[PDB]
Structure formats: structure tokens, C-alpha cells
Design a protein around this ligand. Sequence first.
Ligand code: EF6
Ligand code: ZN
Lengths: 781, 208, 62, 79, 192
Amino acid sequence: MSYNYVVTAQKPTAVNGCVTGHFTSAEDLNLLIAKNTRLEIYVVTAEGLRPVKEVGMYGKIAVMELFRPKGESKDLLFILTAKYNACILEYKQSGESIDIITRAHGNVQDRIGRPSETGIIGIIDPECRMIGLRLYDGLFKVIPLDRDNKELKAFNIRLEELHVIDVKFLYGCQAPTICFVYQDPQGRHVKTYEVSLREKEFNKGPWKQENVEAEASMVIAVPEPFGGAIIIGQESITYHNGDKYLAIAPPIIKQSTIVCHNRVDPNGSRYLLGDMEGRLFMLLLEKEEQMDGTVTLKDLRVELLGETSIAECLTYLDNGVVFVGSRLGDSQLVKLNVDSNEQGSYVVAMETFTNLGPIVDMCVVDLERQGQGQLVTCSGAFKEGSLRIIRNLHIRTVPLYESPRKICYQEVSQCFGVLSSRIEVQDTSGGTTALRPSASTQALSSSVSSEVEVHNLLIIDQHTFEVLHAHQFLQNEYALSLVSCKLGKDPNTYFIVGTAMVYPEEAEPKQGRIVVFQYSDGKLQTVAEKEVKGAVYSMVEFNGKLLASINSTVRLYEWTTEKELRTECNHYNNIMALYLKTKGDFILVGDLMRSVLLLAYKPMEGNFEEIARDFNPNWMSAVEILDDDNFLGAENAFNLFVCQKDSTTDEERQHLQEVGLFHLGEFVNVFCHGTPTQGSVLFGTVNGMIGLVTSLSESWYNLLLDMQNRLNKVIKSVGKIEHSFWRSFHTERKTEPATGFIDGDLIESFLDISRPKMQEVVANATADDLIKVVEELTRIH
Amino acid sequence: REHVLKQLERVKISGQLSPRLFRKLPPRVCVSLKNIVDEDFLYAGHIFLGFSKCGRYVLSYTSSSSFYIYHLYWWEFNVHSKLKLVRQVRLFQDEEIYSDLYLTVCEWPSDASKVIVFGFNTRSANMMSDENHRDIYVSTVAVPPPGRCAACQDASNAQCLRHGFMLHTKYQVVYPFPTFQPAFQLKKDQVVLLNTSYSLVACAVSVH
Amino acid sequence: DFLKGLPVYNKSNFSRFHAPSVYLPTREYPSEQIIVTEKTNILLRYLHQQWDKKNAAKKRDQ
Amino acid sequence: RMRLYVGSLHFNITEDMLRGIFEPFGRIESIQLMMDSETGRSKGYGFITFSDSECAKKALEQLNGFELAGRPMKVGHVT
Amino acid sequence: EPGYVNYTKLYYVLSLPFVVTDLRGRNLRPMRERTAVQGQYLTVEQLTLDFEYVINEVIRHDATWGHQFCSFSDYDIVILEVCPETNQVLINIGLLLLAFPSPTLRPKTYHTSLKVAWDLNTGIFETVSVGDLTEVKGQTSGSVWSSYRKSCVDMVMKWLVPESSGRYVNRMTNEASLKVLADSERYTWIVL
Ligand SMILES: NS(=O)(=O)c1ccc(S(=O)(=O)Nc2cccc3c(Cl)c[nH]c23)cc1
Ligand SMILES: [Zn+2]
């Protein structure tokens, strides 16, 4: 039996949502930030952002909206989690005492219905008549906002349009009205429906259905006096309001997809737009006053303001200050001003907030000492791409201005090997050109192998993090895997790269290479090349041999005295062998769709033996070997699981048993290794969260499990979500309670509760016994 | 079309991995039936039906012989590896069928423990083909155990009731001949709804 | 060219230049409202709705 | 003894649905709705083979040009 | 309690006829006797619904044209919906009947539709739709049943809401024909 302990070393740093309103008081202007499970509450003060309280919800925040129904002196908060936990929250302060009251709560999941492509959409009617939710295709869920009733009886309305792109409630409507963009075989269209609470149905919308651009992706509900809706596409921005129709096709927006918006003025005169390149635009709605006192929209205009971090969300604060919520790079506070600077930009960065996400790869090293470990990650994407050096947390940032993909440390060379990718565009003359300088184009020296992605192997100095050398791979060649190792009887240490040939004509790679490089005298020399018939997804040094996965085959190569790779054996029983980990002669294979399998290299046979497989349809993201008998897996539904060899018949031994299950709530990209607990496995995630997994004895697990049940009776949950429900292994197929896993964050929270509450937790052991237990557990990270 | 590597790179930076994204790209593995079938079952003439809900098994039937005998098979699938026979059951026990049936093997939404076999003839017989009457044959068969089963281990191919039982039923239908509705008939996780022309029967089978 | 005159909620807010505590809810649970979902099928609900209106169209004449 | 061609069908129309619609006209020997190997779905066309010629004739007369979902069904002959 | 519903329960250890057996051929043990504690036992349930009863009950109490009705002929039943959460089976009832027309005499052949919700917990049925009496002029028995089933298909397609990947009813059948055997969730094909 396997007992594991999971604890947070670094909380998620990526921002997935940001809203402004009057939540803490009617007078305070607040900024609320959602960082997956974390909710940060700030007061916009004279100093600039005063933190008031940070709360961790037992769920992944999917919807976060402030709203003010009748009779409320301040805004209330609506939150919907990824597990469909709905709640309405009220902030209450009494002197020095702060409490978040759950006004209403319940789970709004449907047993039927398939989760939508553009995901969960949660919208609130401007008159606060109802909450609208797009959770599944073909259904529109409505939560009536009635205060004089014991239960908020939610209902589903059938939506004929099965593929809705975006939806919003319209302003200035006598009857609550939704406006949505949808796709069908005839293209994309904009449609409206009135929502009847009385009949529990849709009524014909105020304006006729209209055809829109093929890539129309977002709806903006314009406030009164204008009313109507703005639809953002790839090449056009249109306005719709009954008879009124305005359309602009500015060439300035064509290059990159606009992915976020925020209203600057309460009357909707100005909006901020953010694109995939990090460009910031101002959308201007030019008005005209009518003699009947009504204001009509005369024209639309777009102006480029400058560049910010690639924005997931934007929020205008006060006095030209904008918060840039980033998921791919660092978040910011930017200042908007009328006079352009030296480059001609109208945007000036005021503050930068560290974001480690996405952590695509990482490695643990002893750079400065001998016994002290530092974490070096491949962080961010595109222009935000960086290396982050983390130690006990102190964070050092190395900007790359391109996407880092893989990292390996080479001690003998006092350097790191980093695989990276940069975007190049097809121009008028010659081949393709880089749009911005980056690490691969700014190296001390460079070599070449003997919109599009240009791949490189970067040699970065372990002390200064200077780009010493950049080796560019072949045209259309994508570098997928990297290792730094010695092979066979050869005393040299090599950087080994696994690649794939990616063409704009085919879907799957049928060609690639394994390239052996040696770094010497500030340059990379190609020692050997080995042609393969597919993508080299993963490579691991294996007992002086090279283990590699090519499409659906796991292969073992031997390194000869003639400096050549020679195929020894193959394993073909895979769909896509994406992940490889080894311990002794054992190999853990992570499949993209078939969970995990265990192989054993047989030295006396010169072949592999398939030991056992986990017969579960897990879509893997990362794998790790905890010990000889325990295998850790992370999958697409944000869950962790532990597999164990079934402890009479060969068929019984050939079946791996899932003995540990836990809903992490994060997407794990990498696991790396680096008396109360045993072992230490660090993990990097898409949200920049860093966690730790360690093993426990049976007695330690039993005490800590009892402790969780005792703590759960004392610690109240915001939105009244049960801790056990949150940590329950959950997929579209099944929901099972967590087993063999202790929530380290929950047990650590014991040191934060008052002494009178500690005695009630430890009742029928002393408070001091458990204080000593929890304190030694905090020292593991 | 989107390249599989371009699709995989989206996953690493977005954390969004789901089959409803790989929906348009071609299959990852394609293996011919002749390369994974055991040569000893060549004279048998199996009629392969396809995969079970979980990609572990691949089902097939035999229409062996005025008097037809039907058999349901469970084969262990492991990509390029040869199929290994796990279960062989005799469909429609003590029932003599005079004509070749159009049989269909079904699976419940969340119940992986059992399967259903709906077999019907083009028109009933009474040697001579009898019109305005049709024979419907339905069998509820338990699937082999997924792992180690404590009750199965006790043996003197001995398998326990929970992971080794069978159910058989037969009814005559009149004009207009009822419509085959597998999706609705088995929408309830443990129930089979059967239209006997005269009545609709709710058939629930469960092992405790 | 058209950026000037940005919204001012309070002038003080970004006049003074710059460069969060964890909420552990103590044992206190005051709440008096819950969120529930419509148990009945949407096709059945519609047919029930239409037939009940047909019953009202019968009571007006009789 | 008589085979018919069924066309202009909605991509979600099943073989069982086609059996149900065509069976009241007469006894059917074989029904084969053509399916796509790549992206497993109905091609929108198939073949129904009635045991009787006159039974197949009346099935054509009462189903050709008449809408199944919103697509007007096209029932014809072969060879 | 009602006359239209019939329920039968039989337990097994190692109305429709059942040849319940093991993997070999032993007909098990048909009983209802006491076997204390959950020590592995089979449970079969049979909840029937007599169409003949339902038809006569809905025409008598819920049909406005019920006074015009004489007798019915053939009847075709098509399931429109099955709600597993509420245990409700929505069935449509195609009906060929004999009835007198409006007081504007001669008895005529008509066709109608009867939508009925059937509870599986209680066994009690409820009427949700009683169709209009439409005349059968120059059209055969086959023509009227084809037109009826077409309308059932038309409605289910109109109300079709996509289901999650794991609540699907798997349907497998091969002619003697299929070209490939696909494993959709794992993108694996078996070429035949
Ligand atoms: N997803 S769907 O395409 O809407 C769909 C597809 C098949 C099924 S079924 O298996 O229950 N068959 C079925 C349903 C309704 C009428 C008829 C007639 Cl007439 C013959 N067979 C019918 C339900 C829903
Ligand atoms: Zn068993």
C-alpha cells in the first residue's frame, strides 16, 4: 500500500481573471484577482493597491463576477468552480474582524450534457434578474435571482445552437436578453433571445439574426445610452443594435487575435483590447446626441496604444492605470498617457508581478554550493519566455524573448542545454525573418545544422546565464527531447537532441533525428546523427545506453566505439509513448491516452519484457517513479494517481493497481526528484504552481488522515464546498473520494488556527504533540 | 489541418488536453485484423463487432450450424500483440433458431459489469417462413473480471456469479413490428426496455 | 490621438507611488439560501407545460 | 427481389431508424447505410432490399421527396 | 396498486420467460427464500406496462374526442425519452381507431398520437399529450405507420442534446460489412 503527502511549495502565479467593483464597502474601489484556486482582494488606495485578504477556495475558479441586486448596500460576488460549485458571497467587516459570508450555494452540474469547447461561461443580467450559465452544448442554465425564497430553483432551457462561441446579457432591455455568436455548417452568426422566468423558455430576441465573420470570437454588451453589442473578429469589429449596424475592418488588428477586453468608461465610450502578441488597443465608440435625448453610436475607431505582457485579462483601475493579468508572462500595472515616448508608445509599465507559468520543463541543480538545491525552470511562452532560478522563495528571472521548451544541466561544461523555439514570418525577399531579437539570435557564437517555428539548442552559462552558443536545427525541424549524458565506454558527456520534421501539408511526423552534440571551446560540434521514422518525444540515459520513444515505439540504443547509435531492442504496444522515466532496469511509459505501463529491460535476453499495465483510460501529462513498486501519474483532468504492481498468476501480476487518487486542481508538466516523510518529488505546472510529493508510513498516514477529518470540522469553507468533494478524483467518466493522499496545505493550516481551536482538533495527544508534528512537516519545503 | 506536434505544444502552455481537440486528426495506431488474429480460429469464422467502452477488449460472434448456434467472444487487445481469448459464452441457451439472426451487442452508460445481445430474424418460421410474426432474442452476459477477484479465486473456467452469469429471454412481436431503439432502451444504467408489441417491460438485472 | 480624459473615480488613488494575508474561516456558519437544479427533463417539462395550458383552454368554455 | 436507393438523409439518421420507416411497407431482406471510416458517421445514403417488388414500389411512392428532419428524402431504383 | 402495472421479483444463487444460467449451462436456482447478509446473489425485476390498458384509460379520461371513439385497431409504440435521474420513460403511442366525426353521420377510420410519461419507481403512468383525430384517406396501413415513425424521429432530433463522453450506449453490429473497428477515445483502428 502507498501513502503520499502533497504540499504547495509555490502557489499558482498565473492570473485567469480580474474584476473591479465595490465589494469590501460601497466607498472602496476593489480589484479582485483569480489565480486558479486563489482569490486576492485589494482596495485601490492613494498608495496603489492595498491587499486586504487572500482566500483559497476548494475549487478552480471558473466564473468570477461582481453584481449588485436591489437592497444591497455593496456588490455581492458570484463564483462558479470547475466542479460546478456555485456561490454568492458577501464581504463583512466588523472593526478588525473580516468574514466572507455565503449568501447562497449549491452544485449546478447536470448528469447529462457535454462540456463546451469554449468552456464555462457565466453571465449576470444588468438588472440582476438572473444568472446565466453556458456549461454544456445545447443547454442554457438559468439561476433566478430572487431574494424572498428559501431555494434558488435553477432550470435548463434547450438551445438549438449547439456550438456557441460567446454570450452576454444585453443592457437596456425590458425583458432579460442574451446575445450570442454561434457556429454551424453555414458559418458564424449573431442571435438574440429573450429569457422568460415565468415560462422557463426563450422568446424571440429584439433583433434579427445576422451573419458574422468566420472568426467572430467575443461579444461585448455595450451599456446605456448606446445599448446593443460589439462583436470582435480576426479582421473586423462590428456593432449591432436592432436596425443599427456598424462595421470596421482595421488592418492593424489582422496580424493577431484579440483575446480580452475591458470597459474604460461607465457609458461604454472606450474599451481596452488585448491580443495574442501583447498589443494593447483602445476601441472608441463615437457618439451623437439626438433631439429626443437618446444617444446613438455614429462610428467605431481602433488605436494601438503600445505593448504589455500577453494579457489573459485587463482591468482599468483609476487615473490611467491598467492592471494586465497575464497567464503566459508576468502580470503588470501599466500607465496610459496622451504623449508618446522615444519609440512612439503610449504605454509605460509601472510594476511587474512574477509569474512562473507555464512551467513547461525544469531541473534541480547545486550551482553555488555542494548540498544545496536550486530549481531552474523553462517558464512562459513566446516573447514572455524565460528561465527562472528558484531557491529557499528567492526568484531570479532570465528573459529569453522566445519559447523555452526543454532544459538539461551539464556539470562538466558548467552550462545548461535549453531547447527553444522562435516565430519567423515569410517576407518579400529570401526566406523567413525574425520579428523580434531573442536568445537564439543574440548568442556569443552560433551554428546551423548540415508564420513558422525556428528551433534551437541554446548553451547557457551556469553563472551569468549568458547565451554562449545557439545551434539552429534544420528548416521544419522541431526539437522535442533533450538529455545530457555519457554513453557506453565513451568518457565524453554529450547533449543529445530528439527531433521531428513538421510540414504544412501533413498531420503526423514520419521523420526525425537523434543528434549527438559535444560542447567544447565555446562551440557545439555534431558528433553523430541517427535517422528515425517519427517524432522523438522522450529520451532518458539508461545504464550507459540511450532509451528513446519514437511515435508509438520505445527503443533502446547502444553507443559504439565508432561513435554511432545502434538499435538493440523495441517495444511497440503504445498509442503515443510521450513520457519516459527509469529506475534500475525498470521503465515507466506514459501514454497520451492509455495511462501508464511498466517495462523491464532483460540483460540476459537483450530485449524488453512488458511487466504490467494500468487498464484505465488516463490521458497523461507527466509520470514519475516514486520507488521500485510505486508509480506516480498526472493526467488531463488535474488529478494525481499512484499505480502499484498487484501483490499467484502471471495475468494478476500484469495488472497495475491504482492505489492512490487525489484531485490536485493543477496541470502537471514535469516531475523531478529533488523520520516523518521519505523521498522528495517536485512538480511544475501550467499555472506556475510548484508542489512537492513525498511518501508516508502507514502510521503517519493514519494520524494525518484523522487530523484532516478533525480540521475539516473546524475550518469553514468559503462557498461551503466540502474539502472531501474538492480533493475527490474527478473525470467525466467517474468521481471517487481521494485515497492514499494527504493534503499537506490543509494539515499545515493547523499552525494558523487559535490555541482554543487546536485543543478541540486534538480532543481524544496534546496540542504541543501535533504542533511539533506539523512544524517538522513544514521543513520538507 | 493542424499538425499533431502543433496541437501538443498548445497543451504544454494551456493545460487543455481533451479528445474533443484531437477530434479532426487521423488515428494514432492502425493495425490490420489479420496481423493480430490467432491462426487456430481461422476455420471458426469469427465476425468481429469492435471495441468495448474501455479499449481493453474487442468482441466477436460465431454463427455455427435449420439449427444455428451463437457464441459471444472477448479478446484481449494490446496494439500489435496477438489477441488472447478471455471469455467464450453460448448465446440464447436451449433455443433453436431456424434462420440467421441480425444480432447487436450493446453496453450500458456507466455499467461495465454486463453487456446485452439483441438478435432478431427477418421473419419468423412455423421450415416454412411465417409472416406477421417475428422472433426477438435478448441475452444479458457478465463481462470477465478486470483484476484480482476474491470470489473468482475460489474454484474447484470457474467464475463467481458477479463476474460470471448469463440471462436469456425470447418474445414474439406482431405488425407493426416494433422499432429497435438501443440508445433509449438502455438509457437507465441497469434496465432494458423491451417492446413486446402488447407491453413495454422494464428488465433490471443486478448482483449483490 | 484619442486617449485623453480617462475616468477619475478618485484623484488620490494614483498620486502617491508604490514600489496579502490568508483568510482561514473560523467556526461560524450563518446561511439561509441554497441553489438547486430542475430535476424534471426539459422535453417532459415542455409537454407538461403545453398540456396544462390545453386544460385551461378546456376550463374556460366548460 | 427488389432493391432501392435511399439518399439525402441527415447525418444522424441510423440504420434502425431507416428499418422502422421502411418496414411497414413490406418485408426487408437487407438494409445497409453507408458509413464513413474516417470520422465515424453516416454518409447520408444507403440501400434497402425489399422481399417483394410491389412492396418496394409503394415505399418509393410514399417516401420520395418527403422531409425526414428538414432534408427531403430521395428514394430511387438500381441498375 | 394500479391494474395496468405488474411487478415480478426473483432471486438466484449458484411477463417474460427467463432462462437465467451461468457461463456453462446450469439453470441456477429459482427462489425468493432467505439468504441473510450480502453473500453474492442475483436479482431480476420485471415492471410491465399494458399498452391496451393505457390506450383505453387515456381515451376515456383525457381525450376530448373520447365520446366519438368506438374501437382501436393496430398500435405502434416509440420511446421519445428516458430520464435515468427521475426514472421516467416518455413513450409515444401511434393509434389507428374507429370514431364518428363532428356533429356536422358515418363512422370513420382515424390516426392519432398519445404521449405518455411512465414512472419506473411508482409504475404509475401520466398522460402528457392527446393528439388531434386526423382522417386516413386513400393511404395504406404501411403509409400511416411510416408517417408516424418519421414524426417521432423528427421530434427526438429537434430535442437532441449532446451527451458526455462516458454516458454513451455502445452499439456493435457487423454484416456478413464493416471496414474499420474504431476506439474513438484512444484513436486506434482495426482494419478489416
Ligand atoms: N443521438 S440520436 O441520433 O438522436 C439517437 C439515435 C438513436 C437512438 S435509438 O437507438 O433510441 N433509436 C431510435 C430512436 C428514435 C426513433 C427510432 C426509430 Cl423510428 C428506430 N430507431 C429509433 C436515439 C437517439
Ligand atoms: Zn468474481
